[PDB]
Write a protein that binds this DNA or RNA. Structure first.
Lengths: 83, 97, 105, 93, 95, 103, 97, 78
DNA sequence: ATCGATGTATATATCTGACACGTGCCTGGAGACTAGGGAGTAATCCCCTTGGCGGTTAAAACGCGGGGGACAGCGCGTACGTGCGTTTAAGCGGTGCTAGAGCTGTCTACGACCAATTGAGCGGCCTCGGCACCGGGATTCTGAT
DNA sequence: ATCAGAATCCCGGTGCCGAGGCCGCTCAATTGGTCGTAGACAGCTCTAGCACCGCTTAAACGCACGTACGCGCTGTCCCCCGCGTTTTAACCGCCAAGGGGATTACTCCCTAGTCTCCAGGCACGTGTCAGATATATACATCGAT
């Protein structure tokens, strides 16, 4: 089924919790927009790599190994899902 | 009635979410977001649950680091409230486009 | 002592390290002391991390090391934090810190 | 099939360091990934060193200087000491 | 006298192809040589890592293509992949 | 040669030799050096194209490091590519922030 | 006459962004490099091109640092860069803890 | 020594970075930062040279040290 | 000031399912041999780094006014935090399907390797043209009126 | 708006040395041929990713309230900037010496490859205890009166 505007699924309280874990005490109402866009810009940089891995392996399932390798390439190495 | 002054529940939440390790973004909304992002890249792709979980862990870590640097910028600007200019400056300084 | 790990007094496998160095396209030929040295370095690094992780778990009164304790061990040791500064640990969390200006006056 | 991993070796290291402590499966995965990542770092650095010196072999000295490069000061010193102690022990017997 | 190798003549040929009435200095020749070596190292290392990840022992053209797609930005990667595919097909047609 | 068969200006042979001696893989496919030489040739053609454009805009006939830095940073995609690279003798792009300029 | 404070600064900005010359004098920087290298290995010889590469790298790194520091100072509603600006830039970029 | 990085030199470096006004302690802070950066880069270069069994730190060693730090330098046959 | 409410930490039962151990199997490691190339080592050449000296000279250093900027204080309002009832839909959980990861057999073409040959490109040398540099004029600014 | 005053852009002449082209040849790229095995492809399968549906309830949400800080303003005070003058040591040119980079030739010995053997190591099964949960209470503390 076609997916549209799921970026709002990252709710304002979710962005708030992410900031509170990061040590933020006061959050402007205009943050919850920018962060979402920023988050998208992150995923479009990871998934595009991961899919590029998946396309090479002649596979149709994006494995955790592909995402881990994509993050390793992006200088954001990830531990906990294989290496 | 009892009503905490502003900044008390915020600090309590800060301590609570720093003490724990659970995911902060809801699992299904983030799965749908990841599928939406991947839809523009290659159609009819499937994601292992571990792959979506890895993407969620990485995104949460990236956003927490970003909010750490944003809080540092907001404190540098003699503020307490993080603003979009704070995030933009932090991303520019880190070297992101 | 048949295994090379027993010869070197190591718990990480010298033979496996040798195979990965050979079948890993790092060099045409792999020396006989390089697997021993690399296994020793790896063993020291994991011992260094696990000592701190066990201490942190004991601080939380937990017998089992979880990702949170490994994150604490990595991020509390300044030198280890430098080695793994660009590394995300799944379920690791973040160090508990609050900036001075955000605390109430 | 066979999936190679460092689970038993990390268990052994833990039991040497913490006799009465256990490791969760996720923490095992983290430790296995860390071992592989540091292995790749050191092996790649020594490989570049071998290429840079026009040397076709990856011996203990390239690994030693790779450890000296990637690892921080006190950590690098201790790791180099451990590696040379193990190499000496291996050569002796 | 050691015979050091570099990409000087090839960069000069490319420059004369893209800019006939234009020259280049030795300092810029060093920069172009270092840039070519660096991009070669990046693409070759990425394709090597792909070969390792797929548990395949050969670095074929497909690994180079996917390394190009990984390292280069969208439009640049698109153009480079088009150029590479064109060159590979042209080389294959000849024998 | 193989550079003539593929219409390339970088050498297929040299790239093939570096792939073999660089220990990137146990074996190197015969199509990999051609593809990689094509990609390198295109990238250097783009770099030199923009450098020559800058040099003509700078009223010079020889490309110097300043022209290369101008070409690399002015193009957004190439700046994204060489984001962490410092070009020696390259200088910086002239940009003065808005608030710094006088009222 | 007298130029108003802040005009010669802009003129020097324009002049030093249009040039490629080294802004750190070669002999002092070479002596600094030898001083630092004495701490690691005694009786070391440096190629002139090696000190040249060190000087280029240091100039580029300091220019990037000053760009980020200027952005921090401008973000803080200031024009004058301060040690807090440099420390914040280094902390965000990931050098300072 | 480190004081060899004079005040006008740091001023020129800031002007190239686009800085219009410079505080008084910026000079000391910049000297410290530069010393730290040179310490790291020269440590890596000296490690490379020591491994090569050479007593002459080449420009290639400097380029390799910078590339190891994610600061690849072009213009010296890197 | 004492007092009340709300959140956290805790004491303990309870139940679980993830973890440590037993066991079997087989694949990857260990050992012995061979032969081949790569690396250690002594000689040698000779480049390039280090070192000293003078001169003129750009640049670093030092001192002053002040003028712009930073920093502190203060007032306003608004928007962000906190609370609370409401609705959203995430989360858990049972069942079903099948696309597609994963393993396996084959045989094939594609790549390594070795011999011979040759010309592509590297090194060295020589030439002159582009850019370094310098002086007079326009102007494009910058500042005070 | 408008005045003069420096800095800089612009332009012609000069000059110099490094880029662009040519000669030699050397050594690695091309070509032809044989062998071996990596993997491309067809098959089988069976794990798990997708899809669905329902009951539960945690979480998101929109609005009411209010108040704490973002922001603008204003005042002060000070501290960098601009500029001029004295100092200084960077810089360039030139020669000397010699330390060690690099190359060559030789030789040894260290490791790849191969075959045979067998035990560590992984997959699976299973018992069980470290830990997550729901519930009840003591304790801290932050705020209204």
């Amino acid at each position: 089924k076609v997916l549209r505007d799921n970026i709002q699924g990252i709710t304002k309280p979710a962005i708030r919790r992410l900031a509170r874990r990061g040590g933020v005490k006061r959050i402007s109402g205009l943050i919850y927009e920018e962060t979402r866009g920023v988050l998208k810009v992150f995923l479009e940089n990871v998934i595009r790599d991961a899919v590029t891995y998946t396309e090479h392996a002649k596979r149709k399932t994006v494995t955790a190994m592909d995402v881990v390798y994509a993050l390793k390439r992006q200088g954001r190495t990830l531990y906990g899902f294989g290496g | 009635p009892h009503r905490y002054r502003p900044g008390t529940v915020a600090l309590r939440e800060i301590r609570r979410y720093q003490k724990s390790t659970e995911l902060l973004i809801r699992k299904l909304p983030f799965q749908r977001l990841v599928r939406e992002i991947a839809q523009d890249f290659k159609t009819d792709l499937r994601f292992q649950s571990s792959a979506v979980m890895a993407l969620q862990e990485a995104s949460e870590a990236y956003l927490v680091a970003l909010f750490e640097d944003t809080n540092l910028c907001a404190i540098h600007a003699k503020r307490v409230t993080i603003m979009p200019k704070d995030i933009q400056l932090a991303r520019r300084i880190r070297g992101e486009r | 002592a048949k295994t090379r790990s027993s010869r070197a007094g190591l718990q990480f496998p010298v033979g496996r390290v040798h195979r990965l160095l050979r079948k890993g396209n790092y060099a045409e030929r792999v020396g006989a002391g390089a697997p021993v040295y690399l296994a020793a370095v790896l063993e020291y690094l994991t011992a260094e991390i696990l000592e701190l992780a066990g201490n942190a778990a004991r601080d939380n009164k937990k017998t089992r090391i979880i990702p949170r304790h490994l994150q604490l061990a990595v991020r509390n040791d300044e030198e280890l934090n430098k080695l793994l500064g660009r590394v995300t640990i799944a379920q690791g969390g973040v160090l508990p810190n609050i900036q001075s200006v955000l605390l109430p006056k | 099939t066979r999936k190679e991993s460092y689970a038993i070796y990390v268990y052994k290291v833990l039991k040497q360091v913490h006799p009465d402590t256990g490791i969760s499966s996720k923490a095992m995965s983290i430790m296995n990934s860390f071992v592989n990542d540091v292995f790749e770092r050191i092996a790649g650095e020594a490989s570049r060193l071998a290429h840079y010196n026009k040397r076709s072999t990856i011996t203990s000295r390239e690994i030693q200087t790779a450890v000296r490069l990637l690892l921080p000061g006190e950590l690098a010193k201790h790791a180099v000491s451990e590696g040379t102690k193990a190499v000496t022990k291996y050569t002796s017997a």
